[PDB]
């Protein structure tokens, strides 16, 4: 309900209040047991309901498929730190998070606007995500259907 | 120039100061409106007052600010809101006599200018919340929102102590004034002396009438982490009563600061003052929200009469009215409403427009006794999820004067009703109103209603059919009325319901509670192509402009037109649908017979809001067309 935003609606008791949450939500979750069994389909390895994830606008899985190359570089990473506490070097500077948040506070000030160009374009590639998230039509790869929660998320 | 000692308000000078203003105004309000009714308001107005003779002027506030003189007394009237309401209404009263005066013999003749006329100002000041409020404001004019969960039984309230004696008797009564009474120790007649005990006789002194309303407020703009908080506030005399449990309310009166004792029987005090508000004026009905009806009312009419009061029921000029006979002849106004209803929600117009009957739903039959279908018509919808579904619950939710917002899960059969708290500020067990109770008129909007648990429903068997609720449970056992449309929203399992199956399977819900409803709306998407290019021109502008305009345009719309004339239609009309119906009426029940009586019922409930609208006593017998065909529109959405 809370992706209806402003709102829970508690009717139990001695409680008739509608507060406000105003509240964002990141979701960490692990496929259906074991871990995603590419036999299955999406949907099928996710528990969860369509009527859910149709508010995510972002679902980022994280699938693990062992690779030689990449793993060496993992694993240079987490021996580094541990054996030392500060991990990027040459080069980067790693942004510290008080003046991080001091640079996101003044980025929530600004409250932007579109142009038509980029208007009419998202309109386009919204009608190309519609058909081409149906016309996949049954099954595997999906989900579908980019319903408009998706157009507007993005 | 005198003065009141801390008050900078200096008796009289401000009575001129204010007589020039209430004598000569018109509208300098207009300036501050920016313009684009030419003569003076307040002396027409206040000769209705001295002929209808209900006292309570109610001011403005601010008719004051922006005009001069009196720029400076509106200072003085938010900041020192009880002494310069108390000289104002000294002013009024003379100002009334000197209006006498003038036109010599009045009303026969003295004594109408002797009774007490007050003022009750409101409009005053655009104030945040309850909870913002410091310290630094306690006796100040302040604004409050929001619905009323609960109101005591009236509590008297001293004004003149009484007082006899033990000798000889003598029957003489001290008054209170300042908030203590101070009885004489001895005494009268004798007198003597006598050291003889003076008796007082509660039965024989007079009172006035303190009651008090608790108050959940919404000031909006909520700074958060903060909860919705809430309020008691005390009224007094005239306007005891005059608010039901439940609507949503304006109410204007000043902040307050007292202790209560803690031991109740030592003499402490608690320090760490109570506060609470006084409510000098309460402003029921709104411009913005729809009107209540009047069966529904009734007594609170017939009551409020007698003893009189201002405000309750919204009141209309005379031309708008007129605009309203006209618009009426519009032949496309049962479409034009249908677009008017929700501007940002695109196509999907039959939606809007079994919900535009709902807020025009039925007529009201009493029989001789019992009866009371009311005019209740409900509606389920379900569908793919985005489909706005939800944004409709809102709006109506926003329009609807009395209507309570539920989710599903977050509810349970006794949140719905019938509470019996303990009270807390008494220690004593209080009964509450539930959820349906509260939202008796108007229209209750239901989230997510496939999903409430299996003890949940169990209620609305006895709402949908009876109108009424039956609470035999605990303290005490009465059957008390709940009349009030519902409108569901339901996801189907699939989410998507997708093409074939049983539908009437695929809703899930007890297939005979899911035949009650009167309207069900199956809402689908066809991947018109040719549809989404369209509704994404709609949704993805805004975009211009940043501040929401020109949301729907061009298109022809009402915006505060449509809910006076949505009011006007519930009072001023009662349809009848006469013979002509009663053919066709019977032939499309039984063609949907070849689905369950209600079916008709539904039909002829629904129609009649059809007929409601376009101001027809009687119904034709056309519009029963498109009222089986809204039924039969979820049908031609039922092929799949
Ligand atoms: N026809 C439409 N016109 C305008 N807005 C729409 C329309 N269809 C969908 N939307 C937008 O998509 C969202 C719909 O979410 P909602 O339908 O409440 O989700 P659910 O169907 O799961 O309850 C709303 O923000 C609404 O403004």
């Given at each position: 309900?809370?992706?209806?935003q402003?709102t829970?609606?508690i009717?139990?008791?001695?409680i008739?209040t509608t507060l406000?949450?105003?509240?964002?939500?990141?979701?960490a979750?692990?496929?259906?047991?074991?871990?995603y069994?590419?036999?299955?389909?999406?949907l099928?390895?996710?528990?969860?309901?369509?009527?859910?994830?149709?508010?995510?606008?972002i679902?980022?899985?994280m699938l693990?498929?062992?690779?030689r190359?990449?793993?060496?570089?993992?694993?240079?990473?987490?021996?580094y730190?541990?054996?030392?506490?500060?991990?990027?070097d040459?080069?980067?500077?790693?942004?510290?998070?008080?003046?991080?948040?001091?640079?996101?506070?003044?980025?929530?000030?600004?409250?932007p606007?579109?142009?038509?160009?980029?208007?009419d374009?998202?309109?386009?590639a919204?009608?190309?995500?519609?058909?081409?998230?149906?016309?996949?039509?049954?099954?595997?790869?999906?989900?579908?259907?980019?319903?408009?929660?998706?157009?507007?998320?993005? | 120039?005198?003065?009141?000692?801390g008050?900078?308000?200096?008796?009289?000078?401000?009575?001129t100061?204010?007589?020039?203003?209430?004598?000569?105004?018109?509208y300098k309000?207009?300036?501050?409106?920016?313009?684009?009714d030419?003569?003076?308001?307040?002396?027409?107005?206040?000769?209705?007052?001295?002929?209808?003779?209900?006292?309570?002027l109610?001011?403005?506030?601010?008719n004051?600010?922006?005009?001069?003189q009196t720029?400076?007394?509106?200072?003085?009237?938010?900041?020192?809101?009880?002494?310069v309401?108390?000289?104002?209404?000294?002013?009024?009263?003379?100002?009334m006599?000197?209006?006498?005066?003038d036109?010599?013999?009045?009303?026969?003749?003295?004594?109408?200018?002797?009774?007490?006329?007050?003022?009750?100002?409101?409009?005053?000041?655009?104030?945040?919340?309850?909870?913002?409020?410091?310290?630094?404001?306690i006796?100040?004019?302040?604004?409050?929102?929001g619905?009323v969960?609960?109101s005591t039984p009236?509590?008297?309230?001293?004004?003149?102590?009484?007082?006899?004696?033990?000798?000889?008797?003598?029957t003489?009564?001290?008054?209170?004034?300042?908030?203590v009474?101070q009885?004489?120790?001895?005494?009268?007649?004798?007198?003597?002396?006598?050291?003889?005990?003076?008796?007082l006789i509660?039965?024989?002194?007079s009172?006035?009438?303190?009651?008090?309303?608790?108050?959940?407020?919404t000031?909006?703009?909520?700074?958060?982490?903060?909860?919705?908080?809430?309020?008691?506030?005390?009224?007094?005399?005239?306007?005891?009563?005059?608010?039901?449990?439940?609507?949503r309310?304006?109410?204007?009166?000043?902040?307050?600061?007292?202790?209560?004792?803690?031991?109740?029987?030592?003499?402490?005090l608690?320090?760490?003052?109570?506060?609470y508000?006084?409510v000098?004026?309460?402003?029921?009905?709104?411009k913005?929200?729809?009107?209540?009806?009047?069966?529904?009312?009734q007594?609170?009419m017939?009551?409020?009469?007698?003893?009189?009061?201002?405000?309750?029921?919204?009141?209309?000029?005379?031309?708008?009215?007129?605009?309203?006979?006209?618009?009426?002849?519009?032949?496309?106004?049962?479409?034009?409403?249908?677009?008017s209803?929700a501007?940002?929600?695109?196509?999907?117009?039959?939606?809007?427009?079994?919900?535009?009957?709902?807020?025009?739903?039925?007529?009201?039959?009493?029989?001789?006794?019992?009866?009371?279908?009311?005019?209740?018509?409900?509606?389920?919808?379900?569908?793919?999820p985005?489909?706005?579904?939800?944004?409709?619950?809102?709006?109506?939710?926003?329009?609807?004067?009395?209507?309570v917002?539920?989710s599903?899960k977050?509810?349970?059969?006794?949140?719905?009703?019938a509470?019996?708290?303990?009270?807390?500020?008494?220690?004593?067990?209080?009964?509450?109103?539930?959820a349906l109770?509260l939202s008796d008129?108007?229209?209750?909007?239901?989230?997510?209603?496939?999903?409430?648990?299996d003890?949940?429903?169990?209620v609305?068997?006895?709402?949908?059919?009876?109108?009424?609720?039956?609470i035999?449970?605990?303290?005490?056992?009465?059957?008390?009325?709940?009349?009030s449309?519902?409108?569901?929203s339901?996801?189907?399992?699939?989410?998507?319901?997708?093409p074939?199956?049983?539908?009437?399977?695929?809703?899930?819900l007890?297939?005979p509670?899911?035949?009650?409803?009167?309207?069900?709306?199956?809402?689908?998407?066809?991947?018109?192509?040719?549809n989404?290019r369209?509704?994404?021109?709609?949704?993805?502008?805004?975009?211009?402009?940043?501040?929401p305009?020109?949301?729907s345009?061009?298109?022809?719309?009402?915006?505060?037109?449509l809910?006076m004339?949505?009011?006007y239609?519930?009072?001023?009309?009662?349809?009848?649908?006469t013979?002509?119906?009663?053919?066709?009426?019977?032939?499309?029940?039984?063609?949907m017979?070849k689905?369950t009586?209600?079916?008709?019922?539904?039909?002829?409930?629904?129609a009649?809001?059809?007929?409601?609208?376009?101001?027809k006593?009687?119904?034709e017998?056309?519009?029963?067309?498109?009222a089986?065909?809204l039924?039969?529109?979820?049908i031609?959405?039922?092929?799949?």
């Amino acid at each position: 309900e809370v992706m209806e935003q402003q709102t829970i609606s508690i009717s139990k008791a001695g409680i008739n209040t509608t507060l406000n949450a105003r509240t964002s939500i990141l979701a960490a979750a692990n496929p259906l047991y074991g871990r995603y069994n590419p036999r299955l389909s999406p949907l099928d390895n996710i528990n969860l309901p369509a009527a859910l994830l149709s508010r995510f606008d972002i679902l980022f899985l994280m699938l693990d498929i062992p690779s030689r190359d990449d793993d060496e570089k993992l694993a240079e990473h987490v021996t580094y730190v541990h054996m030392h506490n500060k991990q990027p070097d040459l080069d980067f500077t790693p942004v510290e998070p008080s003046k991080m948040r001091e640079y996101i506070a003044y980025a929530k000030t600004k409250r932007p606007v579109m142009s038509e160009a980029v208007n009419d374009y998202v309109v386009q590639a919204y009608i190309r995500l519609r058909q081409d998230s149906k016309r996949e039509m049954d099954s595997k790869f999906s989900f579908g259907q980019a319903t408009p929660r998706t157009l507007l998320g993005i | 120039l005198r003065i009141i000692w801390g008050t900078n308000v200096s008796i009289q000078e401000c009575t001129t100061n204010f007589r020039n203003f209430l004598m000569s105004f018109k509208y300098k309000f207009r300036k501050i409106l920016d313009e684009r009714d030419e003569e003076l308001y307040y002396i027409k107005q206040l000769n209705e007052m001295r002929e209808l003779g209900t006292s309570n002027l109610n001011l403005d506030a601010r008719n004051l600010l922006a005009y001069k003189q009196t720029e400076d007394l509106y200072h003085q009237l938010l900041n020192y809101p009880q002494e310069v309401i108390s000289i104002m209404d000294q002013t009024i009263k003379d100002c009334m006599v000197s209006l006498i005066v003038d036109n010599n013999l009045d009303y026969d003749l003295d004594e109408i200018e002797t009774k007490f006329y007050k003022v009750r100002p409101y409009n005053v000041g655009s104030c945040k919340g309850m909870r913002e409020l410091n310290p630094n404001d306690i006796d100040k004019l302040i604004n409050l929102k929001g619905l009323v969960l609960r109101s005591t039984p009236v509590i008297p309230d001293m004004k003149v102590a009484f007082f006899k004696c033990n000798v000889c008797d003598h029957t003489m009564a001290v008054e209170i004034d300042r908030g203590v009474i101070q009885e004489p120790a001895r005494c009268e007649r004798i007198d003597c002396n006598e050291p003889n005990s003076m008796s007082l006789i509660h039965n024989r002194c007079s009172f006035a009438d303190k009651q008090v309303i608790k108050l959940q407020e919404t000031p909006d703009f909520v700074p958060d982490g903060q909860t919705p908080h809430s309020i008691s506030l005390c009224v007094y005399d005239e306007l005891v009563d005059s608010c039901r449990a439940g609507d949503r309310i304006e109410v204007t009166g000043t902040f307050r600061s007292i202790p209560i004792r803690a031991n109740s029987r030592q003499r402490v005090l608690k320090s760490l003052y109570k506060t609470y508000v006084d409510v000098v004026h309460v402003k029921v009905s709104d411009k913005r929200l729809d009107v209540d009806t009047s069966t529904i009312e009734q007594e609170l009419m017939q009551n409020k009469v007698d003893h009189n009061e201002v405000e309750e029921v919204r009141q209309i000029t005379d031309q708008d009215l007129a605009k309203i006979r006209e618009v009426a002849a519009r032949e496309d106004l049962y479409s034009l409403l249908a677009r008017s209803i929700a501007p940002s929600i695109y196509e999907l117009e039959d939606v809007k427009k079994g919900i535009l009957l709902q807020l025009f739903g039925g007529t009201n039959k009493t029989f001789t006794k019992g009866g009371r279908y009311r005019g209740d018509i409900n509606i389920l919808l379900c569908g793919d999820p985005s489909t706005s579904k939800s944004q409709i619950l809102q709006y109506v939710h926003k329009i609807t004067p009395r209507g309570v917002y539920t989710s599903g899960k977050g509810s349970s059969a006794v949140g719905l009703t019938a509470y019996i708290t303990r009270d807390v500020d008494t220690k004593q067990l209080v009964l509450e109103s539930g959820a349906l109770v509260l939202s008796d008129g108007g229209v209750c909007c239901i989230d997510e209603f496939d999903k409430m648990s299996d003890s949940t429903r169990s209620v609305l068997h006895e709402v949908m059919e009876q109108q009424t609720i039956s609470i035999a449970k605990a303290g005490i056992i009465t059957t008390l009325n709940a009349r009030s449309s519902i409108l569901a929203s339901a996801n189907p399992i699939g989410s998507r319901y997708n093409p074939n199956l049983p539908v009437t399977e695929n809703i899930d819900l007890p297939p005979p509670l899911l035949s009650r409803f009167d309207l069900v709306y199956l809402v689908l998407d066809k991947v018109d192509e040719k549809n989404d290019r369209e509704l994404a021109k709609h949704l993805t502008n805004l975009y211009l402009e940043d501040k929401p305009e020109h949301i729907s345009q061009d298109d022809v719309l009402p915006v505060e037109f449509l809910t006076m004339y949505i009011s006007y239609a519930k009072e001023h009309i009662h349809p009848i649908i006469t013979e002509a119906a009663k053919t066709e009426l019977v032939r499309a029940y039984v063609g949907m017979r070849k689905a369950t009586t209600r079916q008709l019922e539904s039909m002829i409930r629904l129609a009649e809001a059809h007929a409601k609208m376009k101001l027809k006593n009687v119904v034709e017998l056309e519009d029963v067309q498109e009222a089986v065909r809204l039924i039969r529109s979820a049908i031609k959405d039922y092929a799949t």
